[PDB]
Amino acid sequence: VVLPVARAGLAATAKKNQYMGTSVAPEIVLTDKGSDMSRKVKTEDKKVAADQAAAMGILANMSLYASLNPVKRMTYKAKEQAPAYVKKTGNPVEDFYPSSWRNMAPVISLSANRVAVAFEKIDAASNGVKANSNNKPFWKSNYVAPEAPAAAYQRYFPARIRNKAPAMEFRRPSFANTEDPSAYFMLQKETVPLRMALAEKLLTK
Amino acid sequence: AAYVGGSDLQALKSFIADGNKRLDAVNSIVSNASCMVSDAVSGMICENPGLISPGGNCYTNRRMAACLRDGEIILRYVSYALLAGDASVLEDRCLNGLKETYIALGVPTNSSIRAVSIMKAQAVAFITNTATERKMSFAAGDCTSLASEVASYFDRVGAAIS
Amino acid sequence: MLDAFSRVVVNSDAKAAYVGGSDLQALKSFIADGNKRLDAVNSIVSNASCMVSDAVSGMICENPGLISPGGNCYTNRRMAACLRDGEIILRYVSYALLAGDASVLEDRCLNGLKETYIALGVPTNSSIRAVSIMKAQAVAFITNTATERKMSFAAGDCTSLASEVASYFDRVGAAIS
Amino acid sequence: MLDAFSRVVVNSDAKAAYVGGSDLQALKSFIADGNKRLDAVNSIVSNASCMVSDAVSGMICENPGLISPGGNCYTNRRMAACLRDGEIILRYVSYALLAGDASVLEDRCLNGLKETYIALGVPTNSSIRAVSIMKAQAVAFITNTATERKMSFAAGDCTSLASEVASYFDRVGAAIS
Ligand SMILES: *C(=C)C1=C(C)[C@@H](Cc2[nH]c(/C=C3N=C(/C=C4\NC(=O)[C@H](C)[C@H]4[C@@H](*)C)C(C)=C\3CCC(=O)O)c(CCC(=O)O)c2C)NC1=O
Ligand SMILES: *C(=C)C1=C(C)[C@@H](Cc2[nH]c(/C=C3N=C(/C=C4\NC(=O)[C@H](C)[C@H]4[C@@H](*)C)C(C)=C\3CCC(=O)O)c(CCC(=O)O)c2C)NC1=O
Ligand SMILES: *C(=C)C1=C(C)[C@@H](Cc2[nH]c(/C=C3N=C(/C=C4\NC(=O)[C@H](C)[C@H]4[C@@H](*)C)C(C)=C\3CCC(=O)O)c(CCC(=O)O)c2C)NC1=O
Ligand SMILES: *[C@@H](C)[C@H]1/C(=C/C2=NC(=C\c3[nH]c(C[C@H]4NC(=O)C(C=C)=C4C)c(C)c3CCC(=O)O)/C(CCC(=O)O)=C2C)NC(=O)[C@@H]1C
Ligand SMILES: *[C@@H](C)[C@H]1/C(=C/C2=NC(=C\c3[nH]c(C[C@H]4NC(=O)C(C=C)=C4C)c(C)c3CCC(=O)O)/C(CCC(=O)O)=C2C)NC(=O)[C@@H]1C
Ligand SMILES: *[C@@H](C)[C@H]1/C(=C/C2=NC(=C\c3[nH]c(C[C@H]4NC(=O)C(C=C)=C4C)c(C)c3CCC(=O)O)/C(CCC(=O)O)=C2C)NC(=O)[C@@H]1C
Ligand SMILES: *[C@H](C)[C@H]1/C(=C/C2=NC(=C\c3[nH]c(C[C@H]4NC(=O)C(C=C)=C4C)c(C)c3CCC(=O)O)/C(CCC(=O)O)=C2C)NC(=O)[C@@H]1C
Ligand SMILES: *[C@H](C)[C@H]1/C(=C/C2=NC(=C\c3[nH]c(C[C@H]4NC(=O)C(C=C)=C4C)c(C)c3CCC(=O)O)/C(CCC(=O)O)=C2C)NC(=O)[C@@H]1C
Ligand SMILES: *[C@H](C)[C@H]1/C(=C/C2=NC(=C\c3[nH]c(C[C@H]4NC(=O)C(C=C)=C4C)c(C)c3CCC(=O)O)/C(CCC(=O)O)=C2C)NC(=O)[C@@H]1C
């Protein structure tokens, strides 16, 4: 026998200021060039806009002032803000210096009545190769090398020939009188080792 | 929108002898209204730097652009109140419902009063031409009655949020 | 923890700001040695290029092995990274002198710098010698005892800021140790 | 093909030959009495470490004065060099068996050997005894008459190949004679 939502709306409407949720404010502009025929006053309701661009200038400049002030640093102890979740990868180079922050440093510039701080990515170089040329953009951008291996007599045997000998290996076909593609022979050359541990073990015996 | 000028403007000036003095006091506020609001809100943060801290109400660019809007909406009504001579439009459209709005949003009322206090200080400097950085050219005379009235209109703002 | 300024710069809101005009003069009221502190920052910043170039070259003189074949300042990029890091290290100490706070220096720059350097195989002992050379030029510049370039200053005592800067460099040495 | 094999062992810039499938069937057609020859050289290389150690251990057993002070197998360096030479000679004789001619052994191993042994003071008579043991071992493995190892072969006679291998060893003693 009661409609509560209808009562809530009617009670709210009967008291609510219509202008409070519209940001409309009266604009005044006056014209005056020193003659009685020039003077004119006009008024007009006009919605006041939020200029987000100029709000950045106040926010940036004051936060520098808030940080250089040392007595507001103790009478206003500001709060810690927890950083946003970014996944860690275990390598400290990407954990502690991510590419969003890497190489930024504060330029300080001091003039008559102006103290300015600017964070800038610091690059420097040797010859014509820059420090951050390792991380050039993609629009500015092969074979594989093999793994390397570990004399009065000289008239008779040169140093390029000494201790050099043939080397050879075999695998006969697996089955009697029958073809086998897994069968092989190999022929090669190599310098014979010193064999000094076997020579010591043989000399001891 | 309305316009008044020429012969019709002289009729409205006949109703009050300070007609030129009242109009010369609105021209010292609407000409400097951009510098006033920018300095008031900045001066509010010099005094209370916790507003641009984490959890502050002027942290993030979206909120401070709304804070800068509010000092402008407030100042435009007070400038209209001076031109009209009455507080009726100021109270009915701007101040009715403001405090109930601010408590719901979490807007700090005490620091909001500090910005209005600065603009009241900036207003009376401009009206009485006593500003230390800038001057205006005026016919010689005394506007102390009008500068007292602008102070009263700012206090209706402060009372409504207290 | 950050300060008010570096917190907005990590958010990518604004990269630069200035305090000036009347608002600078109000900042002077809340600081002792306010003209002095801005003067000591000027002595570092106006010599930032010469200081870093002196430091890494002095590291070469003190130990020639860094530009050995098989060294670590061999190839042109690693040398350029050495000059870049010495410039980066120096500019944070100049900001730490300005605000009188090591916090942004410690949280942004010094945090995890050692384990990075171990991962790169950077000789941490020689990086000490760069930042300890950079200390010596800073204290020499501030007290105006610098032999080669003399600055013009209103007279007074600057032992306090001289002792302050030596602490900041010593903190960098501790993290990089 | 067999001429290119000789270039692979002689040249210093020869790609190590791999032979399989149809190329191994081609090689089997080129070698004279191929499967017995391949089985003759397999019997040597499969025992080559035991052969060289036993042959030098044999020449020392028969003349222990070679291990006394002033003996030419005294000290580890000498013993190592003798062991090394025994394997070198065995390896070049095994290639002469693969090839069915002595030329690679004569040209690459025996030319100059006598003069080096004379210049070094290496005793040729005891060297000839080491060679004579490896002759006896090689004849035994090729004919499958070794005392402590048997290999697996199709039944037949390989005495021609054993007589040929004996001629290659007998050549080493005639070159250092
Ligand atoms: C924080 C560092 C801080 C503020 C920033 C600033 C806030 C503040 N300002 C005043 C006084 C005035 N500011 C005025 C504005 C301007 N003057 C101009 O010349 C241009 C046109 C305009 C914009 C910059 C004005 C007119 C005044 C009036 C008196 C004066 O001239 O000084 C105050 C003091 C308020 C008071 O008088 O009680 C404050 C707090 N000052 C800061 O410290
Ligand atoms: C190798 C040959 C090697 C050098 C390289 C050099 C390295 C070195 N430098 C110093 C001390 C200073 N360098 C300074 C920098 C300069 N002075 C200026 O006027 C310009 C602007 C600037 C660039 C040239 C300064 C100011 C100092 C401090 C000296 C002073 O009191 O003025 C040192 C000594 C530091 C130390 O280890 O104690 C060294 C070793 N010397 C080399 O041998
Ligand atoms: C002193 C104690 C002393 C010796 C050391 C040893 C030297 C020696 N060796 C042979 C003959 C052979 N040795 C062979 C080698 C091996 N036989 C095997 O079964 C294994 C796998 C391998 C490594 C140990 C072989 C195969 C023979 C041939 C045997 C045959 O006669 O058919 C001899 C005897 C021949 C000669 O005089 O040259 C000697 C002396 N013997 C010692 O007395
Ligand atoms: C003297 C050496 C022996 C003996 C040997 C015999 N082997 C015979 C045949 C044979 N041997 C092999 C292995 C050989 N051929 C290869 O391709 C390779 C390696 C790549 C090797 C090591 C093969 C494959 C064959 C063919 C038969 C088979 O196994 O399928 C053989 C018969 C020769 C013939 O008449 O064709 C003999 C005599 N026999 C002896 O009794 C002495 C001890
Ligand atoms: C207090 C704010 C000042 C001050 C103000 C005075 N102005 C006087 C005369 C005057 N001013 C204007 C311009 C004004 N009247 C308009 O209609 C227009 C807008 C359309 C403007 C903004 C005029 C026209 C006049 C009249 C004289 C003239 O023709 O120039 C004045 C004298 C009193 C009076 O004339 O009523 C005063 C006191 N002077 C000050 O010293 C304080 C700081
Ligand atoms: C130790 C570092 C020096 C030393 C420092 C002093 N500077 C003094 C006065 C002074 N310096 C400046 C320039 C500086 N302050 C600023 O606001 C600006 C621009 C932003 C710069 C970077 C100024 C303007 C002044 C004030 C001039 C005046 O006296 O009217 C000074 C005197 C006391 C003081 O005001 O702090 C000192 C001791 N002087 C030295 O001899 C050592 C080497
Ligand atoms: C700056 C001086 C303050 C501050 C102000 C903020 N106001 C926010 C929103 C807001 N303000 C109003 C009242 C205002 N709008 C009107 O239309 C009228 C006049 C007719 C008045 C004077 C309203 C109704 C609203 C809400 C609607 C909207 O967003 O436009 C605001 C954002 C709140 C939020 O975070 O959501 C701020 C920050 N806050 C401060 O701390 C300083 C003191
Ligand atoms: C010269 C004084 C030293 C030294 C310098 C080198 N640093 C190298 C790479 C590197 N440096 C950093 C830390 C640096 N990056 C930042 O953003 C800032 C803080 C704002 C710091 C201070 C990082 C994270 C890295 C690696 C990532 C990169 O630069 O791309 C470097 C090259 C080694 C390499 O990259 O493999 C050198 C040579 N090392 C020395 O030995 C002398 C003493
Ligand atoms: C073991 C039965 C001997 C014995 C042998 C020693 N030979 C020594 C040195 C040596 N041997 C050769 C010939 C060898 N090298 C080759 O490159 C080739 C074929 C391609 C052959 C056959 C040479 C050229 C040399 C000198 C160079 C080298 O050492 O590699 C040797 C070392 C002598 C010494 O330094 O005292 C020994 C012990 N010694 C014996 O007494 C028995 C009889």
Numbering used by the authors:
A (entry chain A): 36 to 176, 182 to 190, 200 to 254
B (entry chain B): 16 to 177
C (entry chain C), D (entry chain D): 1 to 177
Paper text:
Red algae utilise a megadalton-size light harvesting antenna called the red algal phycobilisome (PBS)—comprised of rod structures formed from stacked, hexameric protein-pigment rings emanating from a protein core that is poised above an integral membrane photosystem. Published cryo-EM maps for two red algal phycobilisomes contain clusters of unmodelled density homologous to the cryptophyte-αβ protomer. We modelled these densities, identifying a new family of scaffolding proteins related to red algal phycobilisome linker proteins that possess multiple copies of a cryptophyte-α-like domain. These domains bind to, and stabilise, a conserved hydrophobic surface on phycoerythrin β, which is the same binding site for its primary partner in the red algal phycobilisome, phycoerythrin α.
We call the family of scaffolding proteins CaRSPs (CALM repeat scaffolding proteins), where each CALM domain binds a PE β, stabilising and locating it within the red algal PBS. Further inspection of the deposited maps for the P. purpureum red algal PBS revealed evidence for continuous density linking clusters of cryptophyte-like PE β subunits together; three such clusters were identified, corresponding perfectly with the three candidate CaRSP sequences that we identified from P. purpureum. The other two clusters have three and two scaffolded PE β subunits which correspond to the predicted domain architecture of the sequences that we call CaRSP1 and CaRSP2, respectively. For the unmodelled region of LR6 and most of the remaining two CaRSPs, we built de novo models including models for the metamorphic N-terminal domain of the associated PE β subunits. Analysis of each CaRSP structure confirms that they are scaffolding proteins given that two have an anchoring domain and all CaRSPs make multiple contacts with red algal PBS rods as they weave between ‘lone’ PE β subunits. Remarkably, the two CaRSP:PE β complexes in G. pacifica precisely overlay with LR6 and CaRSP1 of P. purpureum.
